[PDB]
Amino acid sequence: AGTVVLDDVELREAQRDYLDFLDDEEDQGIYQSKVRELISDNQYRLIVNVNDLRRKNEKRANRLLNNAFEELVAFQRALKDFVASIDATYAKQYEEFYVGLEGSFGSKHVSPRTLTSCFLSCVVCVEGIVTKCSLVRPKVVRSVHYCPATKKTIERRYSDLTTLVAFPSSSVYPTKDEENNPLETEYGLSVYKDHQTITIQEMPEKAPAGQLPRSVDVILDDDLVDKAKPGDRVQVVGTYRCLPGKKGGYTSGTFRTVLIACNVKQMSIAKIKKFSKTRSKDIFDQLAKSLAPSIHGHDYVKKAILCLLLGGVERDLENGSHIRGDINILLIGDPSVAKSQLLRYVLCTAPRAIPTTGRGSSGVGLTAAVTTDQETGERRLEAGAMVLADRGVVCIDEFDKMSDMDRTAIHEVMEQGRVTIAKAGIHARLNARCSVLAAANPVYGRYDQYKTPMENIGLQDSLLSRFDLLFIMLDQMDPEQDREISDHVLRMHRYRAPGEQDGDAMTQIYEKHDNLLHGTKKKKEKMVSAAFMKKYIHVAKIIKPVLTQESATYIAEEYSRLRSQDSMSSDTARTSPVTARTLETLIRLATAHAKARMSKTVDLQDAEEAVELVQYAYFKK
Amino acid sequence: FGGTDMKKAIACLLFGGSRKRLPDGLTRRGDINLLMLGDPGTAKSQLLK
Ligand SMILES: Nc1ncnc2c1ncn2[C@@H]1O[C@H](COP(=O)(O)OP(=O)(O)O)[C@@H](O)[C@H]1O
Ligand SMILES: Nc1ncnc2c1ncn2[C@@H]1O[C@H](COP(=O)(O)OP(=O)(O)O)[C@@H](O)[C@H]1O
Ligand SMILES: [Mg+2]
């Protein structure tokens, strides 16, 4: 086609507007460093805040939201121009670059249930869960052929979705020469791009109760191929378009609507160094004390939860042997001792946390399963709760109600951290390294003091050895303790959020002091802010300490001392048996304490703290 | 007939308490739970309806 366009006021003006938008010379803009980062990382697309564009140029934002394709084309042209300007050499590699979108879209923030034809041809944002995914497939863009008879090579260009409507003249694969000499395809010189299709469903938590769900279909291009997986909660921003049906005579008048993604999102130094170096022991002291103001007392359980948050060190050797580094805890107590509050707080704070109660999930939904795909006849693996929580936390409330077979299944995860799966036609070893919290009621409803803990717990020695720590909590009815508990509870109850009028319906390292949440006496001390706590926890989890020679003999001698004291402990009973796992638990707790205070080696104080914890947990009066 | 205290308890059940989220992310229940144990024919089901 020889038709060309000479002038177009709108397109030229829009391109000029984007050129001025992405200059960042007389402004505090950052996009220049973003482009330099893209050049450094060999990536070929940019993400631009919609709110930023609206602030700088409201008319362009309005036009882009109301009309997508032409404005996106102008964006891509402007990106090509500026990439050529900054570094023309890098722009040679890729044909055209792409634009992502970000920011608060406002009215266009639309649920899969509320997508309508009113938003067609516009850019929309949607939040959902992923249910179906397809295999990655290549697609031809540029084809190259060679003719052995005449020693000539030719090239053909393809453009199918670049243009809105395609015709039979295009998309034809050449096979013969002008004189019927055969052509040989040369796959090395051709160009291909990847293609994938996914399906998104409205989350069951958001859908109205008792109603069937509604879903949308998404196409993922070459860059965003591997960014999504089934069973995942995502947010997708992209165009909403109609699908051209293939040629025919009579049409019913109903198109197919498909969302074409442009952005896919998985929804989620000096201060730290100074604080750590100055505090050392006070680091873990305050972190244990400031774990959760909403919960009263129970310092040992807070210490244990902090040890889970920091964790041990995974180790590997020459022979391929694996040594576990995770910690596991079981709490048993009387009703209303706030075990479930602790579980919920750990769910909120931990990065990868999944709650799975006793009978809520069975043995199949915990680890994994194998299903025969009807579409192809092959065998596929579906991951369970524990496989999804790799290097994460699984919380199990009402642990006693869980059946025996489920606990035998959990043995594989608790011992080695791997899951072996096999059915005729497929077999695999999946990684499931994880940590477990569990809370179980006593068998008699309330913990009996006179009976030994073995009768009350009612669990076999193997399962007890599987757990690193056992804790027993009691509701002692001391008048002064009850007074303290009532004071704390009513102080929390009377508190109201600042900035909210009374009677209405419904970052510094240390938190600001509060008259009610802290109290007048506590003015001499402060609590650590949640955000800094999370940052410090992440940094500590990164750090890799090493064990010293001073503490190894000390810990070994104390383990031997405990195994000999087994005969000496005559006035009290033992909660858990002492096996070879106890020594690994000692080393693990020592390393966790060494993680608490940023350093390079494990010292004696960490071993002493670990041993104090072990002595407290393993024996009771 | 009778059960003025029971009726007042039902009324304050209907009005209900106030729920309170907390800065730690923990929540506390703002609703009331009642139990009625009794002999047959004590007019319990009618109150529930
Ligand atoms: N140490 C404590 N500090 C503050 N509140 C507590 C404490 N112990 C119990 N509570 C209160 O008692 C209730 C206990 O409920 P729950 O945590 O479900 O008990 P359990 O998990 O033992 O069944 C909570 O609502 C909590 O407010
Ligand atoms: N004090 C009362 N005043 C009026 N009706 C009563 C009274 N006590 C019992 N009744 C009548 O007797 C019946 C009680 O049955 P029901 O309330 O179903 O008993 P329950 O709740 O123990 O199963 C009701 O239909 C009610 O009309
Ligand atoms: Mg509970």
XYZ file of C-alpha atoms and ligand atoms in Angstrom:
725
model
C 0.000 0.000 0.000
C 1.429 3.328 -1.136
C -0.877 5.473 0.990
C 0.944 7.810 3.382
C -0.084 10.599 5.752
C 1.534 14.030 5.605
C 0.005 15.985 8.504
C -1.906 15.091 11.663
C -2.255 17.778 14.328
C -3.452 15.530 17.155
C -0.795 12.821 16.863
C 2.077 15.282 16.442
C 0.896 17.393 19.382
C 0.491 14.319 21.600
C 3.997 13.154 20.706
C 5.342 16.617 21.543
C 3.481 16.547 24.864
C 5.041 13.207 25.798
C 8.450 14.514 24.705
C 8.047 17.391 27.157
C 6.678 14.989 29.788
C 9.748 12.756 29.745
C 12.467 15.443 29.604
C 13.310 15.807 33.332
C 15.896 18.586 32.955
C 14.315 21.642 34.623
C 12.311 19.406 36.973
C 12.885 16.945 39.799
C 11.823 14.057 37.574
C 13.422 10.634 37.854
C 12.569 9.045 34.484
C 16.063 9.742 33.127
C 17.614 7.498 35.772
C 14.832 4.991 35.083
C 15.839 4.880 31.412
C 19.488 4.502 32.410
C 18.499 1.620 34.708
C 16.581 -0.005 31.847
C 19.640 0.289 29.603
C 21.771 -1.205 32.383
C 19.361 -4.116 32.939
C 18.712 -4.810 29.214
C 14.950 -4.512 29.788
C 12.737 -2.800 27.232
C 9.660 -1.306 28.914
C 8.826 1.509 31.331
C 6.228 2.067 34.056
C 4.827 5.588 34.452
C 2.549 6.846 37.219
C -0.867 7.933 35.944
C -1.323 10.370 38.831
C 2.024 11.978 37.972
C 0.898 12.469 34.368
C -2.423 13.923 35.517
C -0.625 16.355 37.828
C 1.752 17.464 35.071
C -0.779 17.334 32.210
C -4.407 16.547 33.026
C -5.656 16.666 29.423
C -3.193 14.014 28.257
C -4.167 11.755 31.160
C -7.861 12.200 30.357
C -7.283 11.379 26.689
C -5.104 8.364 27.513
C -7.660 6.912 29.928
C -10.529 7.569 27.512
C -8.578 6.549 24.378
C -5.827 3.958 24.749
C -4.356 2.650 21.499
C -3.322 5.868 19.740
C -1.968 7.440 22.929
C -0.034 4.263 23.735
C 1.442 4.350 20.223
C 2.537 7.939 20.838
C 4.105 6.878 24.152
C 6.050 4.107 22.434
C 7.263 6.486 19.721
C 8.430 8.972 22.359
C 10.265 6.204 24.220
C 12.012 5.208 21.003
C 13.010 8.831 20.410
C 14.452 9.354 23.897
C 16.220 5.984 23.992
C 17.830 6.925 20.679
C 18.704 10.346 22.110
C 20.384 9.088 25.288
C 22.039 6.064 23.649
C 21.244 5.341 20.003
C 23.343 2.157 20.088
C 21.046 0.355 22.534
C 17.892 1.236 20.581
C 19.139 -0.897 17.678
C 18.546 -4.181 19.518
C 14.767 -3.920 19.906
C 12.096 -2.959 17.391
C 9.839 -0.940 19.707
C 9.625 -0.404 23.459
C 6.516 -0.502 25.639
C 4.826 1.489 28.410
C 3.387 0.302 31.706
C 0.842 2.183 33.821
C 0.627 2.718 37.567
C -1.181 4.859 40.117
C -4.712 5.284 41.410
C -7.075 5.089 38.437
C -10.058 6.053 40.596
C -13.373 5.366 38.883
C -11.753 2.934 36.449
C -10.688 0.661 39.322
C -13.069 -2.128 38.338
C -13.839 -5.625 39.643
C -14.292 -8.538 37.203
C -17.991 -8.426 38.075
C -18.296 -4.704 37.239
C -16.467 -4.710 33.897
C -18.954 -3.513 31.294
C -19.083 -2.392 27.682
C -18.883 1.198 28.950
C -15.141 0.723 29.539
C -14.378 -0.716 26.088
C -11.244 0.606 24.332
C -10.061 2.206 27.613
C -7.350 1.268 30.104
C -8.777 -0.520 33.142
C -7.455 -1.960 36.401
C -8.697 -5.266 37.821
C -7.951 -7.295 40.957
C -8.433 -11.049 40.901
C -7.073 -14.559 41.326
C -5.511 -16.718 38.601
C -7.222 -20.000 37.735
C -6.073 -21.194 34.287
C -2.716 -20.904 32.537
C -1.438 -22.258 29.227
C 1.910 -23.388 27.864
C 4.273 -20.814 26.384
C 4.196 -20.841 22.607
C 6.360 -19.016 20.047
C 4.891 -16.874 17.277
C 6.560 -15.871 14.011
C 7.278 -12.199 13.320
C 9.986 -12.179 10.626
C 10.670 -15.164 8.352
C 13.823 -15.902 6.332
C 14.158 -18.421 3.486
C 16.973 -19.652 1.234
C 16.914 -21.134 -2.281
C 19.618 -23.744 -3.016
C 18.697 -23.694 -6.713
C 19.419 -19.976 -7.217
C 21.505 -19.180 -4.090
C 19.211 -16.335 -3.029
C 17.761 -15.525 0.385
C 14.517 -13.643 1.032
C 12.764 -12.251 4.101
C 9.073 -11.697 4.853
C 7.614 -9.468 7.570
C 4.475 -10.299 9.555
C 2.203 -7.909 11.459
C -1.074 -9.406 12.707
C -2.114 -7.697 15.959
C -0.160 -4.540 15.106
C -3.036 -3.686 12.753
C -6.621 -3.898 13.985
C -7.902 -6.002 11.057
C -5.918 -8.514 8.998
C -6.560 -9.822 5.487
C -5.852 -13.108 3.657
C -3.053 -11.478 1.634
C -0.900 -11.333 4.770
C -0.094 -14.251 7.091
C 0.930 -16.477 4.156
C 4.003 -18.677 4.571
C 6.212 -18.754 1.447
C 7.343 -22.163 0.207
C 8.189 -21.824 -3.517
C 10.272 -19.517 -5.679
C 9.004 -17.466 -8.605
C 10.140 -20.332 -10.871
C 8.830 -23.058 -8.502
C 12.290 -23.797 -7.103
C 11.854 -25.137 -3.546
C 12.803 -22.856 -0.663
C 14.449 -24.081 2.537
C 13.342 -22.468 5.791
C 16.223 -21.270 7.972
C 14.960 -21.130 11.555
C 18.071 -19.446 12.932
C 17.539 -16.220 11.007
C 13.814 -15.927 11.744
C 12.322 -13.943 14.633
C 9.865 -15.327 17.189
C 8.126 -13.946 20.265
C 6.529 -15.836 23.141
C 2.796 -15.962 23.831
C 0.652 -17.105 26.770
C -2.993 -16.951 27.872
C -4.330 -16.805 31.443
C -7.716 -16.545 33.153
C -8.561 -14.371 36.174
C -11.466 -14.837 38.589
C -12.931 -12.480 41.174
C -11.624 -13.415 44.612
C -14.118 -15.436 46.713
C -13.553 -13.071 49.648
C -14.848 -10.136 47.585
C -17.683 -11.824 45.701
C -21.197 -11.516 47.177
C -22.103 -14.517 49.302
C -23.947 -17.315 47.533
C -23.368 -16.023 43.995
C -21.424 -17.601 41.151
C -18.096 -16.009 40.176
C -17.230 -14.119 37.001
C -13.948 -14.215 35.119
C -11.871 -12.407 32.490
C -9.391 -13.721 29.908
C -5.940 -12.149 29.547
C -3.238 -12.448 26.877
C 0.393 -12.198 27.992
C 2.981 -11.048 25.446
C 6.686 -11.788 25.168
C 7.862 -9.875 28.244
C 5.143 -10.889 30.712
C 5.167 -14.625 29.931
C 6.357 -16.013 33.275
C 4.948 -13.297 35.556
C 1.797 -15.232 36.532
C 0.955 -18.672 37.891
C -2.314 -20.410 38.803
C -3.711 -19.906 42.278
C -2.172 -16.437 42.583
C -3.693 -13.095 43.585
C -2.773 -10.409 41.045
C -3.721 -6.949 39.813
C -3.767 -6.365 36.057
C -3.858 -3.025 34.250
C -4.476 -3.067 30.524
C -6.731 -2.385 27.584
C -10.214 -3.858 27.192
C -10.969 -4.663 23.562
C -13.206 -6.713 21.300
C -11.994 -9.787 19.439
C -12.350 -9.911 15.629
C -14.072 -13.086 14.514
C -12.834 -14.865 11.413
C -14.446 -14.306 8.028
C -18.046 -15.343 7.434
C -21.275 -14.314 5.792
C -23.841 -14.212 8.604
C -22.946 -12.861 12.049
C -25.008 -13.032 15.233
C -23.648 -9.679 16.409
C -21.931 -10.847 19.614
C -18.209 -10.195 19.971
C -15.755 -11.734 22.419
C -14.130 -9.347 24.891
C -10.506 -9.939 25.881
C -8.288 -7.876 28.171
C -4.797 -7.256 26.778
C -2.430 -6.774 29.698
C 0.134 -4.003 29.929
C 1.041 -4.265 33.627
C 0.806 -7.269 35.957
C 1.446 -6.782 39.677
C 1.749 -9.292 42.518
C -0.007 -7.447 45.326
C 1.886 -7.176 48.609
C 20.820 1.721 56.644
C 22.549 4.102 59.045
C 19.727 3.806 61.588
C 19.867 0.000 61.605
C 23.660 -0.102 61.918
C 23.730 2.458 64.734
C 20.878 0.810 66.644
C 22.396 -2.665 66.378
C 25.962 -1.655 67.243
C 24.809 0.413 70.220
C 22.288 -2.040 71.649
C 23.632 -5.588 71.054
C 21.735 -7.514 73.746
C 19.157 -4.740 74.096
C 18.220 -5.415 70.455
C 16.581 -8.746 71.222
C 15.567 -7.476 74.661
C 13.404 -4.684 73.222
C 12.255 -6.787 70.261
C 10.964 -9.451 72.651
C 9.419 -6.797 74.892
C 7.887 -4.777 72.037
C 6.613 -7.761 70.040
C 2.912 -7.057 70.584
C 1.550 -4.498 73.084
C -1.946 -5.929 72.585
C -0.848 -9.130 74.381
C 0.048 -9.097 78.078
C 3.075 -10.935 79.454
C 4.338 -14.313 78.208
C 7.945 -13.313 77.571
C 9.063 -16.858 76.722
C 6.490 -17.276 73.948
C 7.458 -13.881 72.521
C 11.113 -14.950 72.550
C 10.232 -18.198 70.767
C 8.160 -16.397 68.126
C 11.055 -14.000 67.566
C 13.331 -17.020 67.135
C 10.964 -18.298 64.439
C 11.030 -14.897 62.741
C 14.832 -14.844 62.681
C 15.340 -18.592 62.273
C 18.410 -20.770 61.929
C 20.885 -21.347 59.113
C 20.478 -23.875 56.307
C 23.626 -25.931 55.733
C 24.798 -28.290 52.985
C 27.837 -30.546 52.674
C 29.808 -32.400 50.013
C 27.833 -35.668 50.009
C 24.568 -33.855 49.275
C 23.437 -34.181 52.889
C 20.851 -31.658 54.077
C 20.595 -30.272 57.611
C 17.380 -28.604 58.749
C 17.442 -24.995 59.906
C 13.809 -24.253 60.714
C 12.213 -24.094 64.171
C 8.842 -25.461 65.287
C 6.720 -24.643 68.338
C 3.628 -26.089 70.007
C 1.581 -24.167 72.588
C -0.879 -25.850 74.965
C -2.940 -23.814 77.404
C -6.266 -23.130 79.092
C -8.953 -21.192 77.178
C -8.606 -17.412 76.887
C -4.820 -17.163 77.113
C -4.710 -15.449 73.698
C -3.049 -18.206 71.659
C -5.116 -17.354 68.580
C -4.227 -13.671 68.997
C -0.556 -14.662 68.840
C -1.207 -16.750 65.725
C -3.032 -13.871 64.033
C -0.241 -11.434 64.885
C 2.356 -13.790 63.406
C 0.160 -14.056 60.303
C 0.061 -10.266 59.993
C 3.781 -9.678 60.583
C 5.436 -12.569 58.740
C 5.995 -12.059 54.983
C 4.739 -15.464 53.759
C 2.145 -16.651 56.277
C -0.676 -19.128 55.653
C -3.294 -20.166 58.255
C -4.505 -23.764 58.115
C -6.605 -25.001 61.027
C -7.077 -28.600 62.120
C -9.983 -29.867 60.029
C -9.985 -26.935 57.603
C -7.397 -28.631 55.384
C -6.815 -32.351 54.880
C -3.632 -34.243 54.054
C -4.078 -33.790 50.303
C -4.603 -30.021 50.518
C -1.620 -29.633 52.829
C 1.252 -30.950 50.721
C 0.235 -31.520 47.078
C -1.717 -33.710 44.666
C -1.486 -35.217 41.174
C -4.256 -34.719 38.616
C -4.714 -36.117 35.114
C -5.229 -33.266 32.660
C -8.224 -34.111 30.477
C -7.114 -31.689 27.751
C -3.866 -33.546 26.996
C -3.964 -36.766 29.034
C -0.762 -35.887 30.901
C -0.162 -35.759 34.655
C 0.161 -32.429 36.474
C 1.123 -31.458 40.014
C -0.980 -29.149 42.193
C 0.822 -27.605 45.156
C -0.662 -27.671 48.643
C -0.442 -25.252 51.541
C 3.020 -26.298 52.713
C 4.613 -26.247 49.255
C 3.283 -22.729 48.626
C 4.770 -21.611 51.949
C 8.384 -22.208 50.923
C 10.693 -20.431 53.381
C 7.576 -19.164 55.123
C 5.178 -19.741 58.021
C 2.197 -22.076 58.365
C -0.092 -21.485 61.347
C -2.220 -24.393 62.580
C -4.942 -23.513 65.084
C -6.655 -26.331 66.988
C -3.734 -28.630 66.216
C -5.150 -31.427 68.385
C -8.178 -31.942 66.124
C -5.937 -32.885 63.184
C -6.101 -36.541 62.157
C -3.184 -38.942 62.522
C -2.562 -39.412 58.796
C -2.193 -35.665 58.272
C 0.467 -35.533 60.995
C 2.304 -38.484 59.439
C 2.226 -36.525 56.177
C 3.556 -33.414 57.948
C 6.459 -35.548 59.222
C 8.142 -35.366 55.809
C 8.036 -31.559 55.834
C 9.136 -31.289 59.470
C 12.115 -33.654 59.235
C 13.787 -32.934 55.890
C 11.733 -30.126 54.349
C 10.860 -31.948 51.117
C 7.823 -33.725 49.677
C 8.144 -36.857 47.537
C 5.276 -37.455 45.111
C 4.773 -40.389 42.759
C 2.080 -41.896 40.561
C 2.639 -44.147 37.549
C 3.731 -41.767 34.803
C 5.354 -39.051 36.952
C 7.395 -38.644 40.129
C 8.975 -35.582 41.710
C 10.648 -34.165 44.812
C 9.203 -30.756 45.673
C 10.770 -28.290 48.088
C 8.742 -27.450 51.187
C 11.190 -25.854 53.676
C 8.887 -24.209 56.205
C 8.215 -23.371 59.848
C 5.095 -24.306 61.805
C 3.096 -22.757 64.629
C 0.535 -24.929 66.398
C -1.897 -24.413 69.276
C -3.780 -27.329 70.826
C -6.250 -27.518 73.686
C -5.678 -29.976 76.547
C -7.614 -33.231 76.391
C -9.506 -32.530 79.626
C -10.672 -29.090 78.478
C -8.625 -27.438 81.218
C -5.049 -28.337 82.122
C -4.901 -30.574 85.192
C -2.086 -29.572 87.540
C -1.639 -32.839 89.437
C -1.415 -35.136 86.412
C 1.848 -35.285 84.495
C 1.962 -33.369 81.187
C 2.161 -36.625 79.205
C -1.419 -37.533 80.132
C -2.671 -34.030 79.316
C -0.925 -33.674 75.948
C -1.805 -37.148 74.681
C 0.749 -37.161 71.850
C 3.353 -39.748 70.890
C 7.058 -39.235 71.520
C 7.926 -39.114 67.811
C 5.669 -36.128 67.122
C 6.959 -34.368 70.234
C 10.536 -34.929 69.051
C 9.519 -33.442 65.692
C 8.778 -30.129 67.417
C 11.601 -27.905 68.632
C 9.699 -26.290 71.509
C 6.757 -27.087 73.771
C 5.106 -24.439 75.929
C 2.361 -24.694 78.552
C 0.243 -21.673 79.479
C -2.063 -21.398 82.486
C -4.702 -18.940 83.701
C -3.733 -18.401 87.329
C -6.379 -16.402 89.202
C -4.116 -14.189 91.286
C -5.972 -11.017 92.374
C -3.080 -8.706 91.460
C -2.486 -10.441 88.129
C -6.217 -10.154 87.426
C -6.047 -6.461 88.340
C -3.166 -5.956 85.900
C -5.010 -7.842 83.155
C -8.177 -5.798 83.696
C -6.176 -2.557 83.649
C -4.505 -3.504 80.368
C -7.715 -4.717 78.709
C -9.759 -1.663 79.661
C -6.927 0.693 78.701
C -6.935 -0.889 75.248
C -10.747 -0.762 75.119
C -11.050 2.932 76.018
C -8.425 3.935 73.445
C -9.575 5.713 70.289
C -7.673 6.393 67.089
C -6.297 9.961 66.881
C -7.947 12.109 64.234
C -11.339 10.403 64.661
C -14.050 12.370 66.447
C -15.412 10.798 69.621
C -18.729 9.003 69.262
C -18.275 8.356 65.542
C -19.369 5.086 63.950
C -17.243 2.771 61.794
C 9.643 6.880 60.345
C 11.132 7.191 63.822
C 12.852 4.093 65.192
C 10.985 4.288 68.508
C 7.224 4.753 68.682
C 5.866 7.964 70.185
C 4.808 7.592 73.808
C 1.071 7.238 74.434
C -0.742 8.054 77.668
C -3.036 5.003 77.530
C -1.331 2.485 75.236
C 1.890 2.767 77.274
C 1.168 4.560 80.551
C 2.772 7.231 82.704
C 5.278 4.870 84.337
C 6.614 3.612 80.986
C 7.929 7.072 80.024
C 11.461 5.879 80.828
C 11.344 3.355 77.955
C 9.968 3.175 74.424
C 8.727 0.583 71.950
C 10.088 -0.061 68.466
C 8.003 0.929 65.451
C 6.575 -1.900 63.358
C 8.134 -0.805 60.058
C 11.662 -0.562 61.444
C 11.080 -3.886 63.184
C 10.232 -5.542 59.858
C 13.230 -3.952 58.133
C 15.561 -5.109 60.909
C 14.052 -8.603 60.842
C 14.671 -8.856 57.094
C 18.251 -7.602 57.445
C 18.925 -10.049 60.286
C 17.450 -12.906 58.245
C 19.871 -12.006 55.445
C 22.904 -12.104 57.756
C 24.830 -15.401 57.965
C 26.529 -16.007 61.337
C 29.111 -18.692 62.107
C 29.579 -20.906 65.168
C 32.649 -20.436 67.367
C 34.867 -23.048 69.004
C 34.227 -21.579 72.467
C 30.548 -22.539 72.525
C 30.603 -25.953 70.818
C 32.238 -27.802 73.718
C 30.084 -25.825 76.159
C 26.859 -26.861 74.401
C 27.990 -30.482 74.055
C 28.838 -30.661 77.760
C 25.452 -29.185 78.662
C 23.662 -31.686 76.406
C 25.495 -34.499 78.182
C 24.607 -32.832 81.488
C 20.910 -32.817 80.566
C 20.971 -36.444 79.446
C 22.586 -37.361 82.773
C 20.238 -35.108 84.782
C 17.473 -37.242 83.255
C 18.132 -39.324 86.375
C 18.557 -36.248 88.611
C 15.192 -34.603 87.814
C 13.150 -36.408 90.470
C 10.895 -33.614 91.778
C 9.474 -32.695 88.348
C 8.314 -34.459 85.197
C 9.546 -33.951 81.635
C 7.356 -32.465 78.911
C 9.372 -33.745 75.938
C 11.956 -36.509 75.474
C 15.610 -35.643 74.932
C 16.929 -37.024 71.639
C 19.598 -36.130 69.078
C 17.340 -33.345 67.783
C 17.828 -31.413 71.029
C 21.462 -30.624 70.195
C 20.515 -29.320 66.751
C 17.805 -27.278 68.471
C 20.422 -25.792 70.802
C 22.655 -24.809 67.879
C 19.659 -23.438 65.965
C 18.504 -21.249 68.851
C 22.074 -20.048 69.383
C 22.288 -19.033 65.725
C 18.882 -17.334 65.924
C 20.060 -15.254 68.882
C 23.250 -14.449 66.971
C 20.998 -13.272 64.138
C 19.091 -11.047 66.572
C 22.191 -8.919 67.225
C 23.981 -8.264 63.940
C 27.479 -9.748 64.187
C 29.687 -12.345 62.497
C 30.065 -15.166 65.035
C 27.987 -17.035 67.611
C 28.979 -16.201 71.187
C 28.413 -17.744 74.612
C 25.506 -15.478 75.603
C 23.356 -16.813 72.764
C 24.074 -20.363 73.924
C 23.111 -19.403 77.479
C 19.831 -17.865 76.291
C 19.058 -20.960 74.217
C 19.780 -23.195 77.202
C 17.580 -21.079 79.476
C 14.752 -21.453 76.956
C 15.311 -25.213 76.742
C 15.384 -25.626 80.525
C 12.194 -23.599 80.948
C 10.267 -25.393 78.201
C 11.410 -28.974 78.789
C 10.502 -29.263 82.492
C 7.532 -28.178 84.595
C 6.589 -28.417 88.263
C -45.272 -13.439 79.753
C -42.356 -12.754 82.075
C -38.663 -12.653 81.295
C -38.192 -8.883 81.469
C -34.483 -9.417 82.126
C -34.375 -11.865 79.216
C -36.121 -9.335 76.967
C -33.656 -6.609 77.962
C -30.766 -8.973 77.225
C -32.286 -9.657 73.799
C -32.671 -5.913 73.170
C -29.033 -5.198 74.008
C -28.165 -8.177 71.803
C -30.027 -6.553 68.920
C -28.260 -3.224 69.425
C -24.881 -4.918 69.865
C -21.483 -3.589 70.902
C -18.734 -1.767 69.039
C -15.854 -3.462 67.222
C -12.311 -2.153 67.681
C -9.311 -2.790 65.462
C -5.910 -2.026 66.972
C -2.605 -0.623 65.671
C -0.940 -4.040 65.981
C -3.448 -5.409 63.464
C -5.213 -7.482 66.113
C -8.975 -7.123 66.472
C -11.478 -7.560 69.287
C -15.035 -8.819 68.910
C -17.820 -6.250 69.084
C -20.811 -8.604 69.082
C -22.691 -10.351 71.892
C -23.249 -14.107 72.294
C -26.036 -15.535 74.468
C -27.016 -19.040 75.575
C -30.379 -20.269 76.888
C -30.631 -23.669 78.592
C -34.048 -24.752 79.808
C -36.768 -27.378 80.090
C -39.079 -28.030 77.117
C -41.986 -25.636 76.756
C -40.280 -22.575 78.254
C -40.915 -20.299 75.227
C -37.374 -20.246 73.822
C -37.952 -20.867 70.108
C -40.516 -18.062 69.892
C -37.973 -15.525 71.129
C -35.494 -16.730 68.507
C -38.065 -16.335 65.729
N -2.524 -11.900 78.120
C -3.585 -11.285 77.544
N -3.533 -9.982 77.197
C -4.580 -9.358 76.625
N -5.749 -9.962 76.349
C -5.940 -11.268 76.646
C -4.842 -12.018 77.272
N -5.288 -13.272 77.455
C -6.559 -13.321 76.986
N -6.946 -12.129 76.500
C -8.276 -11.835 75.915
O -9.058 -13.027 75.978
C -9.542 -13.410 74.693
C -9.042 -14.813 74.402
O -9.558 -15.279 73.162
P -8.711 -16.359 72.326
O -7.397 -15.717 71.961
O -9.595 -16.921 71.242
O -8.430 -17.503 73.421
P -7.962 -18.971 72.966
O -7.126 -18.722 71.735
O -7.189 -19.466 74.162
O -9.248 -19.712 72.693
C -8.994 -12.432 73.674
O -10.073 -11.729 73.053
C -8.126 -11.466 74.450
O -8.589 -10.130 74.237
N -45.341 -17.129 78.790
C -45.947 -17.418 77.615
N -46.698 -16.500 76.972
C -47.305 -16.779 75.804
N -47.223 -17.968 75.183
C -46.504 -18.979 75.718
C -45.809 -18.753 76.992
N -45.178 -19.901 77.294
C -45.442 -20.785 76.301
N -46.229 -20.234 75.360
C -46.712 -20.920 74.140
O -46.203 -22.253 74.140
C -45.402 -22.510 72.987
C -43.988 -22.831 73.446
O -43.303 -23.632 72.490
P -41.757 -23.320 72.186
O -41.535 -21.861 72.486
O -41.431 -23.853 70.815
O -40.975 -24.180 73.297
P -39.377 -24.343 73.225
O -38.886 -22.984 72.793
O -38.989 -24.720 74.633
O -39.167 -25.438 72.210
C -45.401 -21.263 72.126
O -46.081 -21.520 70.897
C -46.154 -20.217 72.916
O -47.223 -19.693 72.126
Mg -8.028 -20.149 70.190
